Design a protein around this motif. Structure first.
Motif, PDB file in Angstrom:
ATOM      1  N   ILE A   1       0.827  -1.199   0.000  1.00  0.00           N
ATOM      2  CA  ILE A   1       0.000   0.000   0.000  1.00  0.00           C
ATOM      3  C   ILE A   1       0.867   1.258   0.000  1.00  0.00           C
ATOM      4  CG2 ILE A   1      -1.489   1.345   1.530  1.00  0.00           C
ATOM      5  CD1 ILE A   1      -2.882  -1.227   2.303  1.00  0.00           C
ATOM      6  N   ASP A   2       1.959   1.188   0.769  1.00  0.00           N
ATOM      7  CA  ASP A   2       2.696   2.416   1.003  1.00  0.00           C
ATOM      8  C   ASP A   2       3.453   2.741  -0.272  1.00  0.00           C
ATOM      9  OD1 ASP A   2       3.198   4.325   3.112  1.00  0.00           O
ATOM     10  OD2 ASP A   2       3.242   2.633   4.463  1.00  0.00           O
ATOM     11  N   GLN A   3       3.926   1.653  -0.894  1.00  0.00           N
ATOM     12  CA  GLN A   3       4.474   1.688  -2.239  1.00  0.00           C
ATOM     13  C   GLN A   3       3.516   2.390  -3.187  1.00  0.00           C
ATOM     14  OE1 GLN A   3       6.570  -1.511  -4.108  1.00  0.00           O
ATOM     15  NE2 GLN A   3       6.360  -2.731  -2.217  1.00  0.00           N
ATOM     16  N   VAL A   4       2.314   1.816  -3.296  1.00  0.00           N
ATOM     17  CA  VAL A   4       1.360   2.382  -4.240  1.00  0.00           C
ATOM     18  C   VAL A   4       1.096   3.853  -3.930  1.00  0.00           C
ATOM     19  CG1 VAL A   4      -1.026   2.255  -4.981  1.00  0.00           C
ATOM     20  CG2 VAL A   4       0.276   0.170  -4.640  1.00  0.00           C
ATOM     21  N   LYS A   5       1.036   4.149  -2.619  1.00  0.00           N
ATOM     22  CA  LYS A   5       0.879   5.535  -2.209  1.00  0.00           C
ATOM     23  C   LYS A   5       1.987   6.406  -2.800  1.00  0.00           C
ATOM     24  CE  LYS A   5      -1.783   5.640   2.016  1.00  0.00           C
ATOM     25  NZ  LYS A   5      -1.742   5.668   3.477  1.00  0.00           N
ATOM     26  N   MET A   6       3.194   5.813  -2.731  1.00  0.00           N
ATOM     27  CA  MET A   6       4.358   6.486  -3.293  1.00  0.00           C
ATOM     28  C   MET A   6       4.263   6.725  -4.807  1.00  0.00           C
ATOM     29  SD  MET A   6       7.510   5.371  -0.947  1.00  0.00           S
ATOM     30  CE  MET A   6       7.653   3.599  -1.215  1.00  0.00           C
TER      31      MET A   6
ATOM     32  N   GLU B   1       4.587  10.213  -6.670  1.00  0.00           N
ATOM     33  CA  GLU B   1       5.849  10.396  -7.380  1.00  0.00           C
ATOM     34  C   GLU B   1       5.671  10.447  -8.906  1.00  0.00           C
ATOM     35  OE1 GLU B   1       8.363   7.388  -5.823  1.00  0.00           O
ATOM     36  OE2 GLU B   1       8.341   8.268  -3.858  1.00  0.00           O
ATOM     37  N   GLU B   2       4.551   9.860  -9.378  1.00  0.00           N
ATOM     38  CA  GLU B   2       4.336   9.856 -10.825  1.00  0.00           C
ATOM     39  C   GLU B   2       4.315  11.278 -11.406  1.00  0.00           C
ATOM     40  OE1 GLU B   2       3.990   7.222 -13.031  1.00  0.00           O
ATOM     41  OE2 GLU B   2       4.356   9.008 -14.181  1.00  0.00           O
ATOM     42  N   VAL B   3       5.268  11.560 -12.326  1.00  0.00           N
ATOM     43  CA  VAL B   3       5.296  12.888 -12.936  1.00  0.00           C
ATOM     44  C   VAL B   3       4.587  12.948 -14.305  1.00  0.00           C
ATOM     45  CG1 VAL B   3       7.368  13.574 -11.692  1.00  0.00           C
ATOM     46  CG2 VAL B   3       7.560  12.267 -13.796  1.00  0.00           C
ATOM     47  N   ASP B   4       4.286  11.755 -14.871  1.00  0.00           N
ATOM     48  CA  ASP B   4       3.446  11.709 -16.078  1.00  0.00           C
ATOM     49  C   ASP B   4       1.972  11.935 -15.734  1.00  0.00           C
ATOM     50  OD1 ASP B   4       1.997  11.025 -18.310  1.00  0.00           O
ATOM     51  OD2 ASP B   4       3.400   9.508 -18.961  1.00  0.00           O
ATOM     52  N   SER B   5       1.506  13.181 -15.964  1.00  0.00           N
ATOM     53  CA  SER B   5       0.170  13.541 -15.497  1.00  0.00           C
ATOM     54  C   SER B   5      -0.910  12.662 -16.144  1.00  0.00           C
ATOM     55  CB  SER B   5      -0.067  15.032 -15.766  1.00  0.00           C
ATOM     56  OG  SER B   5       0.097  15.304 -17.158  1.00  0.00           O
ATOM     57  N   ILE B   6      -0.656  12.122 -17.357  1.00  0.00           N
ATOM     58  CA  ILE B   6      -1.623  11.174 -17.927  1.00  0.00           C
ATOM     59  C   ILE B   6      -1.622   9.796 -17.253  1.00  0.00           C
ATOM     60  CG2 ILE B   6      -2.379  10.035 -20.032  1.00  0.00           C
ATOM     61  CD1 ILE B   6      -1.419  12.164 -21.684  1.00  0.00           C
ATOM     62  N   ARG B   7      -0.423   9.272 -17.014  1.00  0.00           N
ATOM     63  CA  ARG B   7      -0.282   7.984 -16.337  1.00  0.00           C
ATOM     64  C   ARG B   7      -0.809   8.050 -14.907  1.00  0.00           C
ATOM     65  NH1 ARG B   7       3.158   3.099 -17.262  1.00  0.00           N
ATOM     66  NH2 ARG B   7       2.456   3.701 -19.373  1.00  0.00           N
ATOM     67  N   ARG B   8      -0.722   9.230 -14.298  1.00  0.00           N
ATOM     68  CA  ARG B   8      -1.317   9.447 -12.981  1.00  0.00           C
ATOM     69  C   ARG B   8      -2.831   9.200 -12.967  1.00  0.00           C
ATOM     70  NH1 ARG B   8      -0.278  14.575 -12.007  1.00  0.00           N
ATOM     71  NH2 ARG B   8       1.953  14.537 -11.434  1.00  0.00           N
ATOM     72  N   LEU B   9      -3.536   9.813 -13.932  1.00  0.00           N
ATOM     73  CA  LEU B   9      -4.973   9.606 -13.980  1.00  0.00           C
ATOM     74  C   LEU B   9      -5.325   8.141 -14.223  1.00  0.00           C
ATOM     75  CD1 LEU B   9      -6.087  12.795 -15.885  1.00  0.00           C
ATOM     76  CD2 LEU B   9      -6.133  12.320 -13.488  1.00  0.00           C
ATOM     77  N   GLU B  10      -4.520   7.515 -15.097  1.00  0.00           N
ATOM     78  CA  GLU B  10      -4.755   6.114 -15.397  1.00  0.00           C
ATOM     79  C   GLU B  10      -4.684   5.254 -14.135  1.00  0.00           C
ATOM     80  OE1 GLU B  10      -1.809   5.401 -18.225  1.00  0.00           O
ATOM     81  OE2 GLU B  10      -2.944   6.083 -19.926  1.00  0.00           O
ATOM     82  N   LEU B  11      -3.615   5.484 -13.336  1.00  0.00           N
ATOM     83  CA  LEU B  11      -3.426   4.748 -12.093  1.00  0.00           C
ATOM     84  C   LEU B  11      -4.597   4.982 -11.137  1.00  0.00           C
ATOM     85  CD1 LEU B  11      -1.875   3.190  -9.985  1.00  0.00           C
ATOM     86  CD2 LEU B  11      -0.547   5.177  -9.468  1.00  0.00           C
ATOM     87  N   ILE B  12      -5.005   6.255 -11.066  1.00  0.00           N
ATOM     88  CA  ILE B  12      -6.126   6.591 -10.208  1.00  0.00           C
ATOM     89  C   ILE B  12      -7.404   5.826 -10.627  1.00  0.00           C
ATOM     90  CG2 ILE B  12      -7.751   8.447  -9.761  1.00  0.00           C
ATOM     91  CD1 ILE B  12      -5.479  10.384  -9.638  1.00  0.00           C
ATOM     92  N   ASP B  13      -7.678   5.825 -11.954  1.00  0.00           N
ATOM     93  CA  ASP B  13      -8.828   5.077 -12.478  1.00  0.00           C
ATOM     94  C   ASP B  13      -8.706   3.571 -12.210  1.00  0.00           C
ATOM     95  OD1 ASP B  13     -11.260   5.141 -13.837  1.00  0.00           O
ATOM     96  OD2 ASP B  13     -10.336   4.520 -15.695  1.00  0.00           O
TER      97      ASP B  13
END
Length: 485
Positions: free
Chosen positions: A9-14, A18-30
């Motif tokens: 979990i703490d990893q995933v939190k990280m 830490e993700e700087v690709d703003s598109i990949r960020r949304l993907e992970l969130i989804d």
């Protein structure tokens, strides 16, 4: 491994931070939501959406994929964003979406998904649905094709969480770009929640056994009754509410059978009248099988009222009586139609059938459970009934009917079916509007929406989810008894 879980979990939190690709960020969130594990990260997700997309937006407003994904996730987490973010993609005339978009498949998929977050009167979103559906439906990644077929079958905004998580995990592990940690945490987590569901289920079964209704009314349905709740009540702390909702489902279904199949009209009048009195003296009037149906319901409801009086210092008895007499009286109205040869117009039928589907008792009992401090004005507003309640129950009813007087029948053709499908569309828009503007607790708005979603899940593919080897029954066993390996 709980040690293993805490670590992942703490990893995933990280990664989220830490993700700087703003598109990949949304993907992970989804992905986290769909895999069933977004609760660990809820505060983090909201913070990110607020600071980097809702403000300081990092998304290129000229990119369809990105723009649509941002739109959907923002509205999903109750952030305001206008339909106009899509103006940039429409044609010279402004009348429809640029023909050149047909080549952006993943972009079209997200535009399609995003369109379902629509309220009423958002023409640009209506244009989006029609355009994106049109150019996804038949056409020359093995994983993309797959996402598409599922979306056309049921849009993500209409999908419940837990009862859908397995099929997502299955798909997510087949994606070349998938993350081994996220997956591991999704599977382990699945199995842990499944274990929680099994205990709750055992407690629901114990309660059902204790009623003895199976012996007095010649059978166990209670797994089905429970399975509903894994979709209507998404939050994990709410084990008590899932068990409670199971009782309601079981009591509603039992009584519905009494009115639809067992009781004579005379007995039905007796029962309904007893429910109106809502007392013990009425036991005098009822035949044995009704005495024990009545008192089982009576004691359950009064126990829920006690809990609310004890915990929140609020007397909910007048409201719970209202919803249960309202349900029972709607049964009798329907029963009386047959004897009078009465054939209601759709308008007349709907006016009754969103009450007779039995969603009001569900929402009422949950309103009192899932609200921290009960105010009289709040209780009154919900029991009006509030448009959000009417919307929830209407989709529940329409979804049920499309599974099988009925909605189509009250209208039959493909055309009556098309009319119903359009009503479901029009109601979800009303639902979304209410979700954006509710004063009710976040938890209650959730069950309102999830009750509607679960109905669409149970009766998916316009079929009857519980008709032996339904493809829902299989899903039921896969969620409740089969560990994810």
């Amino acid at each position: 491994h709980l040690m293993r879980a805490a670590g992942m979990i703490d990893q995933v939190k990280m990664m989220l931070q830490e993700e700087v690709d703003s598109i990949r960020r949304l993907e992970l969130i989804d992905d986290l939501r769909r895999l069933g594990i977004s609760c660990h990260f809820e505060r983090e997700i909201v913070e990110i959406l607020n600071s980097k997309y809702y403000t300081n937006n990092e998304i290129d407003e000229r990119d369809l994929y990105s723009t649509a994904l941002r739109f959907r996730l923002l509205r999903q987490y109750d952030f305001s964003v206008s339909q106009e973010v899509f103006d940039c993609f429409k044609n010279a005339k402004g009348t429809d979406f640029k023909p050149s978009l047909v080549d952006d498949t993943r972009g079209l998929l997200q535009l399609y998904e995003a369109s379902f977050l629509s309220a009423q009167g958002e023409e640009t979103l209506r244009l989006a649905r029609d355009f994106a559906t049109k150019f996804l439906q038949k056409r020359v990644d093995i994983n993309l094709l797959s996402s598409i077929e599922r979306a056309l079958e049921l849009p993500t905004h209409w999908r419940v969480q837990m009862p859908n998580a397995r099929s997502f995990i299955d798909a997510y592990k087949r994606r070349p770009d998938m993350n081994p940690t996220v997956l591991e945490l999704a599977k382990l987590d699945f199995n842990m929640v499944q274990a929680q569901f099994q205990q709750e289920l055992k407690e629901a079964s114990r309660w059902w056994n204790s009623t003895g209704l199976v012996h007095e009314l010649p059978r166990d349905r209670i797994v089905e009754c429970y399975y509903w709740t894994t979709g209507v009540v998404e939050r994990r702390q709410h084990g008590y509410e899932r068990i409670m909702l199971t009782k309601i489902n079981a009591l509603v279904t039992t009584i519905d059978d009494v009115f639809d199949i067992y009781g004579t009209l005379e007995e039905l009048q007796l029962f309904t009248t007893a429910i109106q009195r809502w007392d013990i003296e009425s036991m005098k009037q009822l035949p044995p099988y009704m005495q024990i149906c009545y008192l089982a319901l009576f004691n359950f409801v009064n126990e829920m009222a006690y809990d609310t009086l004890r915990d929140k210092g609020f007397d909910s008895t007048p409201y719970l009586r209202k919803v249960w007499v309202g349900l029972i009286e709607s049964y009798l109205i329907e029963a009386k139609w047959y004897y009078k040869g009465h054939k209601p117009s759709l308008e007349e039928y709907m006016k009754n059938s969103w009450i007779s589907i039995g969603g009001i008792p569900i929402l009422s009992h949950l309103f009192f459970r899932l609200t921290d401090s009960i105010e009289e004005e709040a209780a009154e507003s919900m029991h009006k009934y509030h448009d959000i309640v009417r919307a929830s129950c209407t989709i529940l009813r329409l979804a049920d009917d499309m599974g099988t007087p009925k909605s189509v029948q009250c209208y039959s053709e493909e055309e009556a079916r098309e009319h119903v499908r359009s009503l479901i569309d029009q109601t979800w828009k009303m639902m979304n509007k209410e979700m954006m503007t509710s004063s009710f607790s976040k938890y209650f708005v959730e069950v309102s929406a999830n009750l509607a979603r679960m109905a669409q899940w149970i009766y998916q593919h316009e079929s009857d989810g519980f008709g032996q080897h339904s493809l829902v029954n299989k899903m039921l066993r896969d969620l409740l008894f089969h560990r994810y390996e």
